[PDB]
Write a protein that binds this ligand. Structure first.
Ligand SMILES: [Zn+2]
Length: 73
């Protein structure tokens, strides 16, 4: 999933920069560079955001830009 991305936005924060004999980069492993934390990847990028929603409330907002009527929350 590299050649042809719709609009990956929830990745700029969680970017895995690894390269070596093992090249774990291939595996499904993600870590928050911002807080040098480790966050496993799930079926979808649902946790990716959640992590911030609680961790970094500043980044979450900037990433949470919905253009529509207000929801309960
Ligand atoms: Zn973080």
């Amino acid at each position: 999933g590299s050649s042809g991305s719709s609009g990956s936005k929830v990745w700029k924060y969680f970017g895995f920069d690894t390269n070596a004999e093992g090249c774990i980069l291939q595996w499904k492993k993600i870590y928050c560079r911002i807080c040098m934390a480790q966050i496993a990847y799930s079926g979808n990028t649902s946790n990716l955001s959640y992590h911030l929603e609680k961790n970094h409330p500043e980044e979450f907002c900037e990433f949470v830009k919905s253009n529509s009527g207000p929801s309960s929350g």
